[PDB]
């Protein structure tokens, strides 16, 4: 689609068998999801943004469906105030900024 930015660019995702709402965020290096269980191994990570840093769990090789488009990559899980799809997965669905 072509998404205008008059409102927050929220889309439905599917991750870990669960349907969720998430924010498409061109400013985020990484994808970070509110607390949930994911299979496989993880390791701890600290990531920074406005407000400072949070500790998250880093799960690699996780498949997510974003607005109908399948991608795989690293997903971080931790106390983010909103689910965020960042550049590591936006590239895989061919997202661009256009003006």
Ligand X SMILES: CCC[C@@]1(CCc2ccccc2)CC(O)=C([C@H](CC)c2cccc(NS(=O)(=O)c3ccc(C(F)(F)F)cn3)c2)C(=O)O1
Catalytic residues: 25
Judged by CB under 6 A, which stretch of 13-21, 35-43, 67-75, 82-90 contacts ligand X? 82-90
Q: What angle do CA 93, 10, 58 make, to 5 degrees?
A: 65
Residue 61 touching Na ion (CB under 5 A): yes
Stretch that binds its own copies, among 5-13, 36-44, 57-65 (CB under 8 A): 5-13
Counted residue by residue, the chain has a size of 99
Residue 69 belongs to what H/E stretch? strand 69-77
Report DSSP letters for 28-49, one per residue. Answer: -SS-EE-S---SS--EEEEEEE
**Binding to ligand X (CB under 6 A): which residues in 23-42?**
23, 25, 27-30, 32
Residue 54 binds its own copies (CB under 8 A): yes
* CB-CB contact of 58 with 44 (8 Å): yes
Comparison of 4 and 17: residue with beta carbon closer to ligand X: 4
- Binding residues for Cl ion (CB under 5 A): 36-37, 73-74, 88
């Amino acid at each position: 689609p072509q998404i205008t930015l008059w409102k927050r660019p929220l889309v439905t995702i599917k991750i870990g068998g669960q349907l969720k709402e998430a924010l498409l965020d061109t400013g985020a290096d990484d994808t970070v999801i509110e607390e949930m269980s994911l299979p496989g191994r993880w390791k701890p990570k600290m990531i920074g943004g406005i407000g400072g840093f949070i500790k998250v769990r880093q799960y690699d090789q996780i498949i997510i469906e974003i607005a109908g488009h399948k991608a795989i990559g690293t997903v971080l899980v931790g106390p983010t105030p909103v689910n965020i799809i960042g550049r590591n997965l936006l590239t895989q669905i061919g997202a661009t900024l256009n003006f």
